[PDB]
Amino acid sequence: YDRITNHIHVRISHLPLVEELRSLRQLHLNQLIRTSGVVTSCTGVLPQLSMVKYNCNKCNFVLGPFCQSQNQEVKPGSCPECQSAGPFEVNMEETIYQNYQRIRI
Amino acid sequence: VEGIVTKCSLVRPKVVRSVHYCPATKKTIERRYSDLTTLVAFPSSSVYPTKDEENNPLETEYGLSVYKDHQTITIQEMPEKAPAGQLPRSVDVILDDDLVDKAKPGDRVQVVGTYRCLPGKKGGYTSGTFRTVLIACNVKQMSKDAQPSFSAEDIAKIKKFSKTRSKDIFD
């Protein structure tokens, strides 16, 4: 099984609590709550910008990987590569996108 | 770029050798553009720089200057030879000075140009930003300035056709 990708996300079903979609405010923040509801619309495949390679030449080290997804980003001023920056170069086939979809409830 | 001329622009005096005059040190400056668009040029920029050999302000004196009649025309080839996967092109053609009112729409020509590019200062490293331009060295006219000249066939054969005729030459 190690030949395939890892990071298996476990699941959990049958929760003893169900809350409607009107009684949730700031008291249920960051709480795993089981909330149902009808789906209005869905979105297909969206090429989310999650990692873009940039060719650099200063210490024989290519810049990356970066973080540009909607979950978390890296603001300029504190680079993860020990706070380093150099020349950039736009590519055409070194961009690996991540799946991302939004659902209306 | 061969084909049929479609659109034609106006005639504007293009500045070539501007008489740079300075109301101070009284010095002459011979500055040439550098953008692969005029005659002698180099890949640089043409956004009216402020550089000078003596760092003096220069103004264009139109007393003894040299102009150039600039007129850009478009040439589109006929779509009668277009297969099923190719699209015609349209590149502008720069006219000359001694060819005023010699490129009217609805007439075929025969121009000889040189395809070049314009450098851009957008960003640090210049990528694949290269626009289309054509510097025509000579514009030739086939159906306007040129015409089928006569010879020894349009002098004798025309007179003999009206003499030894049959009834009337109108029929």
UniProtKB/Swiss-Prot annotation, chain A:
Zinc finger intervals, C4-type: 56-82
Location within or outside the cell: Nucleus; Chromosome
PTM statement from Swiss-Prot or TrEMBL: Phosphorylation by the CDC7-DBF4 complex during G1/S phase is required for the initiation of DNA replication.
Domain of life per record: Eukaryota
Annotated disease: Deafness, autosomal dominant, 70: A form of non-syndromic sensorineural hearing loss. Sensorineural deafness results from damage to the neural receptors of the inner ear, the nerve pathways to the brain, or the area of the brain that receives sound information. DFNA70 is characterized by slowly progressive, postlingual hearing impairment.
UniProt function note: Acts as a component of the MCM2-7 complex (MCM complex) which is the replicative helicase essential for 'once per cell cycle' DNA replication initiation and elongation in eukaryotic cells. Core component of CDC45-MCM-GINS (CMG) helicase, the molecular machine that unwinds template DNA during replication, and around which the replisome is built.
Subunit structure: Component of the MCM2-7 complex. The complex forms a toroidal hexameric ring with the proposed subunit order MCM2-MCM6-MCM4-MCM7-MCM3-MCM5. Component of the CMG helicase complex, a hexameric ring of related MCM2-7 subunits stabilized by CDC45 and the tetrameric GINS complex. Interacts with DBF4. Interacts with KAT7. May interact with MCM10. Component of the replisome complex composed of at least DONSON, MCM2, MCM7, PCNA and TICRR. Forms a co-chaperone complex with DNAJC9 and histone H3.3-H4 heterodimers.
Family: Belongs to the MCM family.
Additional remarks: Early fractionation of eukaryotic MCM proteins yielded a variety of dimeric, trimeric and tetrameric complexes with unclear biological significance. Specifically a MCM467 subcomplex is shown to have in vitro helicase activity which is inhibited by the MCM2 subunit. The MCM2-7 hexamer is the proposed physiological active complex.
Designated name of the protein: DNA replication licensing factor MCM2
Source species: Homo sapiens (Human)
Source taxonomy: Eukaryota, Metazoa, Chordata, Craniata, Vertebrata
Chain's gene name: MCM2
From Swiss-Prot, chain B:
Record-listed Phosphoserine modification sites: S34, S149
Role summary: Acts as a component of the MCM2-7 complex (MCM complex) which is the replicative helicase essential for 'once per cell cycle' DNA replication initiation and elongation in eukaryotic cells. Core component of CDC45-MCM-GINS (CMG) helicase, the molecular machine that unwinds template DNA during replication, and around which the replisome is built.
Natural source organism: Homo sapiens (Human)
Annotated family: Belongs to the MCM family.
Modification type N6-acetyllysine: residues: K167
Other known facts: Early fractionation of eukaryotic MCM proteins yielded a variety of dimeric, trimeric and tetrameric complexes with unclear biological significance. The MCM2-7 hexamer is the proposed physiological active complex.
Protein's name in the database: DNA replication licensing factor MCM3
Full-protein positions shown: 127 to 297 of 808
Cell location: Nucleus; Chromosome
